[PDB]
């Protein structure tokens, strides 16, 4: 714990980055979070929505 | 079946040819929801219920 200040900097950046990654799984109202599932199933007039 | 007592069958462990239905000119309607009717032959399913 003696070096906790440096460990803290590392942990905060790691957490922020992992959060950015996890957000890719959110749907935000979409049928799927996966861009490829949208593209492989819908025609452009719907895929674009 | 009568609509009040509609039938159901499971489709599994097979090759699903959808072009045979899609391009059949005998249908009066062919409406797909959530998927394009022309991309069906490229997709896999757990199963299909008819």
From Swiss-Prot, chain B:
Domain of life: Viruses
Name the record gives this protein: Spike protein S1
Gene: S
Effect of residue 24 to L: In strain: Omicron/BA.1
Effect after changing residue 24 to F: In strain: Omicron/BA.2, Omicron/BA.2.12.1, Omicron/BA.2.75, Omicron/BA.4, Omicron/BA.5, Omicron/BQ.1.1, Omicron/XBB.1.5, Omicron/EG.5.1
Species of origin: Severe acute respiratory syndrome coronavirus 2
Subunit structure, interactors included: Binds to host ACE2. RBD also interacts with the N-linked glycan on 'Asn-90' of ACE2. Cleavage of S generates a polybasic C-terminal sequence on S1 that binds to host Neuropilin-1 (NRP1) and Neuropilin-2 (NRP2) receptors. Interacts with host integrin alpha-5/beta-1 (ITGA5:ITGB1) and with ACE2 in complex with integrin alpha-5/beta-1 (ITGA5:ITGB1). May interact via cytoplasmic c-terminus with M protein. May interact (via N-terminus) with host bilirubin and biliverdin, thereby preventing antibody binding to the SARS-CoV-2 spike NTD via an allosteric mechanism.
UniProt function note: Attaches the virion to the cell membrane by interacting with host receptor, initiating the infection. The major receptor is host ACE2. When S2/S2' has been cleaved, binding to the receptor triggers direct fusion at the cell membrane. When S2/S2' has not been cleaved, binding to the receptor results in internalization of the virus by endocytosis using host TFRC and GRM2 and leading to fusion of the virion membrane with the host endosomal membrane. Alternatively, may use NRP1/NRP2 and integrin as entry receptors.
